[PDB]
UniProtKB/Swiss-Prot annotation:
Residues 1-221 form the Peptidase S1 domain. This is Serine protease 1. It is an enzyme of class 3 (hydrolase). Subsequent cleavage after Lys-125 leads to alpha-trypsin. Further cleavage after Lys-170 yields pseudotrypsin. A cleavage may also occur after Arg-99. Not sulfated on tyrosine residue(s). It comes from Bos taurus (Bovine). It is found in: Secreted, Extracellular space. GO terms for molecular function: endopeptidase activity; metal ion binding; serine-type endopeptidase activity; serpin family protein binding. It comes from the Eukaryota. Ca(2+) binds at residues 52, 54, 57, 62. The active site is at 40 (charge relay system), 84 (charge relay system), 177 (charge relay system). The gene is PRSS1. Keywords: Calcium, Digestion, Disulfide bond, Hydrolase, Metal-binding, Protease, Secreted, Serine protease, Signal, Zymogen. InterPro entries: Peptidase_S1_PA, Peptidase_S1_PA_chymotrypsin, Peptidase_S1A, Serine_Proteases_S1, Trypsin_dom, TRYPSIN_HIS, TRYPSIN_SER. It catalyses: Preferential cleavage: Arg-|-Xaa, Lys-|-Xaa.
Length: 223
């Protein structure tokens, strides 16, 4: 399988589903009490769902915990999607185990050509509407900034990166907003946006988490 595939149940134990009566976004557990997602996923009355695979069926490993708090990045711009990052605090601590685990924050930014893992539940179809029920995965390289910016001239900031293939075919667009991009075991990316869907010279665009680590640590410690 070159591209999107079924992860396997609980193979991505940091992966979280944000539910408002339905699954609406992804997010990542970064410690027992906190979740990172995209600021475009901001909503009232989130329930965070951990240990999911099939989000429509109770399979036994789940943990369902209300969000108590959401903090959108102070410089989030919802027009440009610049600084598309939000922190979500859990009402009760998650219970950590094999299937429900934190993902580390990066100590450095990952370089172009680094292979990363992108996960989520969202739409599989570049052309049409098909929403799958178990966790899906994609492995794609981080693209060079030149290649990213040339695909979206005037749209890419320092706080974004692109990942995938310049030919398209394989991408995450609506393919799970707020979901993780993990590279060498560290959280590098958040599924942010992407013009079209797996279009030729239209990659995925991700929030560059390595720019935010000071923000995330300071904010979680003070809240
Ligand atoms: Ca389930």
């Amino acid at each position: 399988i070159v591209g999107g595939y079924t992860c396997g149940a609980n193979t991505v134990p940091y992966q979280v589903s944000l539910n408002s009566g339905y699954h609406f976004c992804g997010g990542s557990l970064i410690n027992s009490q906190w979740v990172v997602s995209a600021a475009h996923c901001y909503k009232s009355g989130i329930q965070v769902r951990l240990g999911e695979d099939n989000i429509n069926v109770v399979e036994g490993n789940e943990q369902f915990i209300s969000a108590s708090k959401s903090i959108v990045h102070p410089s989030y711009n919802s027009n440009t999607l610049n600084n598309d990052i939000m922190l979500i605090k859990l009402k009760s601590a998650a219970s950590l185990n094999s299937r429900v685990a934190s993902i580390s924050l990066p100590t450095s930014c990952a370089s172009a050509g680094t292979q990363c893992l992108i996960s989520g539940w969202g739409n599989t179809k570049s052309s049409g509407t098909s929403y799958p029920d178990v966790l899906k995965c994609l492995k794609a390289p981080i693209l060079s900034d030149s290649s990213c910016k040339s695909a979206y001239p005037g749209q890419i900031t320092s706080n974004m990166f692109c990942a995938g293939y310049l030919e398209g075919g394989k991408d995450s667009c609506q393919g799970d907003s707020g979901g993780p991009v993990v590279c060498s075991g560290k959280l590098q990316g958040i599924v942010s946006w992407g013009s079209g869907c797996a279009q030729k010279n239209k990659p995925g665009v991700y929030t560059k988490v390595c720019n935010y680590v000071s923000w995330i640590k300071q904010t979680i410690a003070s809240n």
